[PDB]
Design a protein around this nucleic acid. Structure first.
Ligand SMILES: [Mg+2]
Lengths: 1340, 49, 586
DNA sequence: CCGAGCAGCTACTTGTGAGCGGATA
DNA sequence: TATCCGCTCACAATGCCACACGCGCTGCTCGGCC
């Protein structure tokens, strides 16, 4: 079974890996993200409930007045997406929130609140994305890319090498919340520990530790262990465990139980440890000079004198030892210090701790946070408790707590948003351990540590940023509001939140309009992951670590799709089968592998769980029953390829395309190309321009059937039905009986979009590709959009290409083209440019768009209409006034009598200024559409009336089609009900029943049914009239433009630009070039059969830049064309359908054990002829990214046709007419015309305008400006001689306000001699320095 | 292009370039640490004369 | 000054103002407020705070952001002060004093011009018209064609048939300056005589763009007009392409031929063992060219011809000697191009890149500069022509896979397997295992590369009245590689043979090599490791060109403070130059 | 009261060099 | 008290080109010898 569009023209496929997971929705990421944004979710989960329940409710300053939040709702969009595009307003929706003001009387803290005010209030509008994941803010379609940043949680960086130049590696722990204040623990070059709060002063960690009501003994018991020294008869015996002395030398005779164990000066070895553990002894004998090196743990108080003998973190001395012995403390707890197990880091941080108690710690940390402002202890504590433990300024999200609990090896993964003392204790212990040697650092180059945020999360963040401002506003407004004086509507304003969301969608480092030039760019732009913007690094401050791609990027992000230039690696494209995890990570599907069989199920593994299991090779030769043909298999354990067994593996790749992007999967024979060429090709395919007539690519990849369908460029069938009405503008389909709704249903209508300007000055047009009466299925394509062909992506065009030098015209990378290409309307494209004319309201009278243009003849005004706008279809090549804008300059109050008089008699209209808008000098073409928007109040000109009347006629045509269908059904029903009165029906109801429903007899049932049907009829008519009136009021409603404008006029100039020497064209393997010189058809080389070649590339570009696959593709292309040729030879000569069917079967049954297995005997024996007709142009061939056709398959496919097997054919010269030796290869290659047309690059200026800040010539191509003589150009010129040349290039041609005029006057008078003068910008610098307190002066 | 005017400041002020040169001119000329000169400049302390 | 302050009437009641205007206005506001407070006898603390605020305002006007608090005026962006209008890459020095935009300039995408001579270049018609409008006006006023400037301007706008000849006359000997966007050395800007061409692209000579480092994949270059007699004479005298044949860095010529011409000449001179007309005799190179173009003989075949060479004696004499040589028809045909001074031993070679470069070097050394330009031009012409007539083409069957590559790969696999067995036996540790795997894979890669080379050289046997006469391989990819045209040894090794070893992020070498090539299919993980290793080298240049530009700017700033101002200093001290022999031999 | 212009609603760069305490003999 | 060491702050980080876009709303304060 195959789809209906596949029955039109099924594409031959190769490959031997039967895929198990189909291609998912290419735009599922942003669609699912925005679906998670706007929806009623309980438990305050992602979207909008979290932002509300986190901020709301709000309470006054103990005023018993609370504002509760119940729910929210999104109203219907006030304008459709098409209406928003044609008008320019945003495709947004209202946000009505039902709030609850519960204010209660005084003298009752928890008194039962009464006089509840439950009210729905509107607060700003939010932009809704279309079915394609695009936002329409101001006419254009803006897409929000997903941002890759650091996952909230904890990280452990290892600063080595140059860091501190001391040869000591430091380890710094960073706690980064999702929203709040950071935390950073680190070590000095010494063994000191310090902490900082958001890049503040480096201060010790014991102070912030004791800030949370922590004493010294508690900290010491938490961090370090306890060594017990007992006061025995003498020698102060000590407990011993043979594992704590591992690695130390014996400074004394370690002997116990009357038996020597370790001698003085013997390092305790592992055998010594085993010997000391065999007897299991604890108490030994230790000298007096050994205790002096240790240090007491806790503060031991005296009971005789009531004083302190010794404090913590103070090394013991002999006098202190005698004191503590005479005090009576038998058990003395000391620290266990060992550089290999427990490095002393808290002891030093303790002895550098200036403050001891909790209160001075708080005031010191307050002084460290805020300069000065010395509070008391209770006033300072507010800051320390509000910065790290308040849920309003610390917002560790669910993924943050998850990563935090996973990093510290904790079972539970849930928690709160605020921190806790035990968490800080644990992270400090982890830092100490990772310094001691136990534990490894967490690299930043790991997808498990890099979190991806979608448009929904950024929108929620900005919503919260606005909500905190509105919260402060409503809190300061609630300071005076009392009971029974205000509804919960006036205290809330739309301003902050609405503006916040609007600016987040309008102007940001992520808010950009989509590059609407081809569906491939549309898909690769929405699946684009950036590292810039807020919360991400900058390209100017990025190291060689974020640019490099990790082995953890396998299947989660493409490694070959990257914009080469200023940001390499920072901007990537998501993988094909990559999905967004619930927590916000990159998940990749994998097939679960059991002992012997690989079950056809999928598990979406995360980034952290990759190293735990092992993944099997994607293209590993596998046997039946989910087995491997070989015992050993190529796998990867932890980002390292290796060789494993057939049973140790646990997971397999789902397919072979998940490693590349969707923009890279369309590169045929990608496995035969280098990484650099593949990157340059996949990037250039993004810049394809839609040709005038699309055409199927021969050497395809199979994925093309998805991009052109999964996107929103083509007309997809929402309900499969029968074609009713085919037209270039609209397509009307009749829904099948089953798919049709059982009530108030009808037929579907798709309004195709005609030639309209895109976001890159390209034409976007949809062409119907269905026939009348042809049944279509649901999801099938109906109309091919730009660069599409029967539901298949088709960017460029296939051409006959040879590879041989031709008189150096393909010198380095230049492309040679025959006149046959440009003559056949092949690469000619359409460019649509928008020109705006605004009638701004100024003083002295507003502007007019009339047609009375004085100081000019009729030739320049012959293209203007009665209203003052150029006609629809009026060509223009030079500067010509296409809209009659005039503005009054002096006295207003020009009487209408004298106004019409000036148009007939009298003098000219004075107060005009001739400020009309004309087309710039250099652009040509024919205007195809004019747009006008009039503010409510200004007189609508008759052209706007005509435009709205035309669109109303269109909408009325649709509504009348619907109404006539419903009325035909209803009249069939009335015929079915009055059949009882048959003779009068057939007599006086054949012609006149359509207007004479009035009948009557036999009341009981006939009157009942007739009345029911008449009621249905009048209700239907009234409903359709209501729909028509609503549409009229909608399309006639004037849109707002700006404060101080009357009307805005827009025109669209469409120019057809053909290929010419100077254009940039490229294949699909990074072989770019420029058309060197168009050639006559006779001069181009031709084969011994007479078919001339179209494109003659340079074969020398293949070896160095290793893109060989194209050649293969070329070969395959030839084979494809060959088959088509045969079909043409079978179509021109009238052949029976049996021979054609057998030939197509033999072609599709190529001997490669492919997974296609299509049969021709199942077709209708009629669509076979249509399919063959759709194959005479060639045989479309699909090719997986890595399972492509081998050499032998292409060889046998070529030998199927009459083409030579070697792929190289003898070629004759077009000029000399002789045979080229060394038979050149030739085939059919798919090429692309890049969006770098020469007509927008060539530019020149003799003498134009000059800047006002300094008298220097402008540049650019839009304005008539020259080029910039760069500083390196000045260096190269002064490296030469040319002193006069530099002096003229600097001031005489650019800056001399009085020299360039003199030089021009001399040149036009035949005088080639210059005058130095003085550069004006130098005087500008003199004035600027003089504007300062610095005096600059020229001497004699 | 060349005619200039002026502003008669009621209070004579310091030139930030000569005060934030690192080393600043006044910081070396007046043999006074830049911290104290900045303290005097922003009116949070006094200097005797 | 007021007009020096940017303030232009924007669309509507709003005006596009400067950042200095807000500064000056705030300064004036606070000054007026302070003057008011001083008259009302305000409290000491109030006037103190007012003086502090006025000080803040004036120091922000002087240099905003230096005090510590970068105030914003609009858009929440740092405001522009007077110091900001001088410093950085946006002050007057970097933007409006050193490099300024010039008039009479243009810009366009480049394209290959293979017919124009070395000293000239192409130029679009509309471009040339727009550049030389004043010269056209002057020449129109000269003849009895245009009385005033308005008539000439209208005729130029209309572009009558009487103005094209004027444009051809004004660009008869008026050179222009071609300039690449990134300028590195003196050759970043050159002078060329323009010839008018109907089109929108700039036709460029193929032998000069190599100096420009300008490929034809869409590079746009700029054009400038000298506009002065001194200027035109300087551009014709110094900045001309003919006057710059040796790079200022090294004495090696910068006019070295590119890949196309050298491939054509290599194919022309690469002789086979048997072809059409092997063993015959030819009188002169003209008869050889006649016999070749007639098709009665091949292009490369050992033939005994007679050459008439010329040798330069001690004085300016050119002695002539006629002798019979045994050379290929290609060399004999190419001999009609070289001037008389050069001997025949320079053509009787395979004529690779190094060979043709040293040939041009010897030509410039013996014959000077005047004939060297036309010699190189004729070299390029003949190379293009014969490379076109040759039919060089790369194909799938052209790249051959070594038949014994499979057994070598299997032997290396057995070796790494027994090494892993030894490691599992506990005898060898992990580091020595890694080293013994890396070196074994390197030896296997060297063996398979030597095999691929000696295989690409063989299977070229042709019967010349005998049984087998194995010769130099005529494979197209080998012709493009061995001749040094475009392909190197390592490139073709990665192409046909195994790619070898790759790298990991830190810089080490992975223990699993890429046992596949490009012609054969590449595994998914192999291609992943390949692109991982290649992205590093790709981003390398993209990040490093910035440091290169900064270094160039620093170096030129340290430079340009000295010129040759004396003819002799009159000292005797110097440096003792010695050939360094550290490390290797020398 | 009127009009005109202007204000509130931060942290993966790293390295280099210079300056300012600061603590150790 | 001199003097090396550690912490803090100023300054730098190609070049070109091409396209597109932007600085709002309510609120506050100053404007004026005919
Ligand atoms: Mg280039």
């Amino acid at each position: 079974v195959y789809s209906y569009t596949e029955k039109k023209r099924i594409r031959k496929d190769f490959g031997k890996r039967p895929q198990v997971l189909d291609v998912p929705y290419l735009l599922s990421i942003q669609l699912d993200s925005f679906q998670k944004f706007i929806e009623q979710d309980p438990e305050g989960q992602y979207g909008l409930e979290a932002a509300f329940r986190s901020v709301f409710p709000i309470q006054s300053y103990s005023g018993n007045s609370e504002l509760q939040y119940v729910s929210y709702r999104l109203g219907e969009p006030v304008f459709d997406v098409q209406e928003c595009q044609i008008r320019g307003v945003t495709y947004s929706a209202p946000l009505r929130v039902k709030l609850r003001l519960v204010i209660y009387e005084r003298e009752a803290p928890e008194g039962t609140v009464k006089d509840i005010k439950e009210q729905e209030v509107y607060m700003g509008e939010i932009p809704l994305m279309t079915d394609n994941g695009t936002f329409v803010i101001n006419g254009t379609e803006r897409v929000i890319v997903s941002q890759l940043h650091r996952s909230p949680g904890v990280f452990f960086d290892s600063d080595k090498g140059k860091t501190h130049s001391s040869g000591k590696v430091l380890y710094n722990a960073r706690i980064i919340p999702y929203r709040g204040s950071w935390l950073d623990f680190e070590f000095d070059p010494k063994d000191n520990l310090f902490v900082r709060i958001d890049r503040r002063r480096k201060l010790p960690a014991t102070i912030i530790l004791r800030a949370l009501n922590y004493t010294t003994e508690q900290i010491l018991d938490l961090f370090f262990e306890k060594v017990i020294f007992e006061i025995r008869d003498n020698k102060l015996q000590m407990e011993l465990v043979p594992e704590r002395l591992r690695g130390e030398t014996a400074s004394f005779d370690i002997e116990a139980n009357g038996k020597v164990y370790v001698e003085k000066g013997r390092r305790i070895t592992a055998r010594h440890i085993r010997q000391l553990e065999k007897d299991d002894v604890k108490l030994i004998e230790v000298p007096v000079e050994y205790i002096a090196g240790k240090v007491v743990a806790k503060d031991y108080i005296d009971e005789s004198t009531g004083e302190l003998i010794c404090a913590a973190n103070m090394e013991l001395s002999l006098d202190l030892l005698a004191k503590l012995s005479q005090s009576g403390h038998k058990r003395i707890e000391t620290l266990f210090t060992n550089d290999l197990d427990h490095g002393p880091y808290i002891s030093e941080t303790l002895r550098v701790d200036p403050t001891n108690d909790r209160l001075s710690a708080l005031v010191e940390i307050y002084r460290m946070m805020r300069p000065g402002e010395p509070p008391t202890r209770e006033a300072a504590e507010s800051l320390f408790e509000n910065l790290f433990f308040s849920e309003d300024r610390y917002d560790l999200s669910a993924v943050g707590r998850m990563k935090f609990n996973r990093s510290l090896l904790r079972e539970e993964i849930e928690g709160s948003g605020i921190l806790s003392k035990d968490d800080i204790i644990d992270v400090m212990k982890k830092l100490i351990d990772i310094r001691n040697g136990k534990g490894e650092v967490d690299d930043i180059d790991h997808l498990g540590n890099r979190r991806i945020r979608s448009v929904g999360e950024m929108a929620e963040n900005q919503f919260r940023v606005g909500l905190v401002r509105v919260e402060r506003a409503v809190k300061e407004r609630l300071s005076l509001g009392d009971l029974d004086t205000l509804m919960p509507q006036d205290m809330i304003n739309a301003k902050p939140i609405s503006a916040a969301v609007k600016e987040f969608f309008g102007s940001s480092q992520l808010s950009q309009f989509m590059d609407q030039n081809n569906p491939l760019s549309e898909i690769t732009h929405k699946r684009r992951i950036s590292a810039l913007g807020p919360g991400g690094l900058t390209r100017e401050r990025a190291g060689f670590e974020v640019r490099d791609v990790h082995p953890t990027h396998y299947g989660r992000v493409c490694p070959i799709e990257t914009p080469e230039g200023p940001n390499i690696g920072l901007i990537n494209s998501l993988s094909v089968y990559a999905q967004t995890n619930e927590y916000g990570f990159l998940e990749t599907p994998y097939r679960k592998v059991t002992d012997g069989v690989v079950t056809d199920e999928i598990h979406y593994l995360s980034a952290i769980e990759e190293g735990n299991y092992v993944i099997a090779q994607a293209n590993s030769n596998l046997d039946e029953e989910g087995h491997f043909v070989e015992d050993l298999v190529t796998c990867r354990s932890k980002g390292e390829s290796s060789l494993f067994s057939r049973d140790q593996v646990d997971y397999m790749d789902v397919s072979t395309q998940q490693v590349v992007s969707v923009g890279a999967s369309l590169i045929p024979f990608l496995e035969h190309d280098d990484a650099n060429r593949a990157l340059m090709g996949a990037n250039m395919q993004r810049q394809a321009v839609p040709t005038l007539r699309a055409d199927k690519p021969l050497v395809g990849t199979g994925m093309e059937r998805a991009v052109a369908v999964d996107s929103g460029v083509t007309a997809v069938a929402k309900r499969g039905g029968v074609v009713q009405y085919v037209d270039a503008s609209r397509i009307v389909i009749k829904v099948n009986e089953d798919e049709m709704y059982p009530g108030e249903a009808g037929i579907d209508i798709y309004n195709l979009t005609k030639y309209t300007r895109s976001n890159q000055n390209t034409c976007i047009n949809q062409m119907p590709c269905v026939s009348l009466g042809e049944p279509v299925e649901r999801g099938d394509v109906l109309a091919d959009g730009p660069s599409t062909d029967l539901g298949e992506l088709a960017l460029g065009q296939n051409m006959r290409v040879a590879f041989m030098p031709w008189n150096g015209y393909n010198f380095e990378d230049s492309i040679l083209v025959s006149e046959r290409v440009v003559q056949e309307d092949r690469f000619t494209t359409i460019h649509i440019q928008e020109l705006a004319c605004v009638s701004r309201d100024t003083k002295l009278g507003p502007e007019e768009i009339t047609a009375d243009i004085p100081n000019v003849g009729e030739a320049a005004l012959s293209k203007l209409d009665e209203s003052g706008i150029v006609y629809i279809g009026a060509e223009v090549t030079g500067g010509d006034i296409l809209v009659g804008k005039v503005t009054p300059k002096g006295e207003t109050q020009l009487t209408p009598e004298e106004k019409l008089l000036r148009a007939i008699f009298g003098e000219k209209a004075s107060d005009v200024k001739d400020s009309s808008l004309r087309v710039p000098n250099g652009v040509s073409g024919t205007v195809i559409d004019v747009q006008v928007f009039t503010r409510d109040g200004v007189e609508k000109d008759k052209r706007a009336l005509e435009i709205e009347e035309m669109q109303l006629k269109q909408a009325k045509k649709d509504l009348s089609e619907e109404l006539q269908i419903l009325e035909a059904g209803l009249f069939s029903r009335i015929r079915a009900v009055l059949v009882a009165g048959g003779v009068e029906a057939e007599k006086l109801d054949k012609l006149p029943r359509d207007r004479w429903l009035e009948l009557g007899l036999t009341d009981e049932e006939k009157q009942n049914q007739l009345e029911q049907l008449a009621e249905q009829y009048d209700e239907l008519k009234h409903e359709f009239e209501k729909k028509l009136e609503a549409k009229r009021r909608k399309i006639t409603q004037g849109d707002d433009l700006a404060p101080g404008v009357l009307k805005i006029v827009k025109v669209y100039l469409a120019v057809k630009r053909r290929i010419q020497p100077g254009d940039k064209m490229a294949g699909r393997h990074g072989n770019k070039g420029v058309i060197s010189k168009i050639n006559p058809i006779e001069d181009m080389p031709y084969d011994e059969n007479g078919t001339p070649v179209d494109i003659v590339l340079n074969p020398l570009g293949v070896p160095s830049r290793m893109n060989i696959g194209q050649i293969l593709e070329t070969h395959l292309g030839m084979a494809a064309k060959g088959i088509g040729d045969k079909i043409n030879a079978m179509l021109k000569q009238q052949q029976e359908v049996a021979k054609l069917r057998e030939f197509i079967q033999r072609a599709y049954d190529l001997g490669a054990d492919v997974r296609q297995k299509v049969d021709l005997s199942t077709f209708s024996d009629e669509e076979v002829m249509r399919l063959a007709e759709n194959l005479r142009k060639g045989m479309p061939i699909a090719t997986p990214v890595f399972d492509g056709a081998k050499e032998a398959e292409i060889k046998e496919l070529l030998k199927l046709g009459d083409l030579p097997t070697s792929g190289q054919i003898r070629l004759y010269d077009g000029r000399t007419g002789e045979q080229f030796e060394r038979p050149v290869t030739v085939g059919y290659m798919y090429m692309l015309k890049l969006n770098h047309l020469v007509d927008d690059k060539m530019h020149a200026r003799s003498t134009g305008s000059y800047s006002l800040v300094t008298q220097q010539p402008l540049g650019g191509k839009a304005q008539f400006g020259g080029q910039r003589f760069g500083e390196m150009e000045v260096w190269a010129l002064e490296a030469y001689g040319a002193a006069y040349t530099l002096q003229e290039m600097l001031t005489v041609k650019s800056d001399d306000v009085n020299g360039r005029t003199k030089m021009y006057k001399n040149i036009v008078d035949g005088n080639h001699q210059m005058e130095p003068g003085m550069p004006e910008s130098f005087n500008v610098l003199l004035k600027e320095i003089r504007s300062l307190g610095i005096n600059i002066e020229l001497e004699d | 292009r060349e005619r200039m005017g002026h502003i008669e400041l009621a209070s004579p002020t310091a030139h930030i370039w000569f005060l934030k040169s690192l080393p600043s001119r006044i910081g070396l000329l007046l043999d006074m640490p830049l911290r104290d000169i900045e303290r005097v400049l922003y009116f949070e302390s006094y200097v005797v004369i | 000054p007021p007009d020096l302050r940017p303030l232009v009437p924007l669309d509507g009641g709003r005006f596009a103002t400067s950042d200095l205007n807000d500064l000056y206005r705030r300064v004036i506001n606070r000054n007026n407020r302070l003057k008011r407070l001083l008259d009302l006898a305000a409290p000491d603390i109030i006037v103190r705070n007012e003086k502090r605020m006025l000080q803040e305002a004036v120091d922000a006007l002087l240099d905003n952001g230096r005090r510590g608090r970068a105030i914003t005026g609009s858009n929440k962006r740092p405001l522009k002060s007077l110091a900001d209008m001088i410093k950085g890459k946006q002050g007057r020095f970097r933007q409006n004093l050193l490099g300024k935009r010039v008039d009479y300039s243009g810009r366009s995408v480049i394209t290959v011009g293979p017919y124009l001579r070395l000293h000239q270049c192409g130029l679009p018609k509309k471009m040339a018209l727009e550049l030389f409008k004043p010269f056209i006006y002057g020449k129109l006023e000269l003849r009895g064609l245009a009385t005033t400037i308005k008539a000439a301007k209208k005729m130029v706008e209309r572009e009558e048939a009487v103005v094209w000849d004027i444009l051809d006359e004004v660009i008869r000997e008026h050179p222009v300056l071609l300039n690449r966007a990134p300028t590195l050395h003196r050759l970043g800007i050159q002078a060329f005589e323009p010839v008018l061409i109907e089109g929108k692209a700039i036709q460029l000579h193929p032998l000069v763009c190599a100096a420009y480092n300008a490929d034809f994949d869409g590079d746009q270059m700029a054009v400038h007009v000298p506009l002065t007699l001194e200027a035109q004479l300087e551009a014709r005298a110094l900045m001309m392409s003919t006057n710059n044949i040796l790079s200022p860095a090294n004495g090696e010529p910068i006019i070295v031929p590119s890949q196309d011409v050298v491939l054509g000449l290599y194919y022309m001179t690469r002789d086979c063992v048997n072809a059409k007309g092997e063993g015959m005799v030819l009188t002169g190179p003209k008869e050889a060219e006649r016999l070749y173009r007639s098709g009665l003989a091949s292009l490369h075949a050992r033939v005994k011809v007679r050459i008439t060479e010329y040798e330069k004696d001690a004085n300016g004499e050119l002695v002539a000697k006629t002798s019979l040589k045994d050379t290929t028809v290609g060399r004999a045909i190419l001999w009609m191009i070289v001037p008389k001074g050069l001997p025949y031993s320079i053509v009787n070679q395979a004529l690779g890149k190094k060979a043709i470069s040293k040939m041009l070097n010897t030509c410039y050394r013996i014959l000077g500069l005047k004939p060297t330009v036309i010699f190189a031009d004729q070299i390029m012409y003949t190379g293009f022509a014969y490379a076109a007539r040759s039919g060089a083409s790369v194909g799938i069957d052209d790249m051959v896979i070594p038949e014994k590559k499979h057994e070598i790969i299997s032997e290396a696999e057995a070796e790494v397997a027994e090494i892993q067995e030894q490691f599992q036996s506990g005898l060898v540790t992990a580091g020595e295992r890694y080293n013994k795997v890396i070196d074994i894979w390197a030896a296997a890669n060297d063996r398979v590369s030597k095999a691929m080379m000696d295989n690409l050289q063989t299977e070229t046997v042709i019967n010349r009245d005998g049984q087998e006469e194995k010769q130099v391989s005529f494979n197209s990819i080998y012709m493009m590689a061995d001749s040094g045209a475009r392909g190197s040894a390592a490139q073709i090794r990665q192409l046909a043979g195994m790619r070898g070893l790759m790298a990991k992020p830190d810089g080490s070498i992975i223990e699993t090599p890429i046992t596949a090539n490009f012609r054969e299919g590449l595994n998914v993980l192999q291609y992943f490791i390949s692109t991982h290793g290649a992205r590093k080298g790709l981003a390398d240049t993209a990040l490093k060109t910035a440091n290169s530009g900064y270094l160039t700017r620093r170096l030129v700033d340290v430079a340009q403070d000295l010129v040759v101002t004396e003819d002799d200093c009159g000292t005797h001290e110097g440096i003792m130059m010695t050939p360094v022999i550290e490390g290797g031999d020398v």
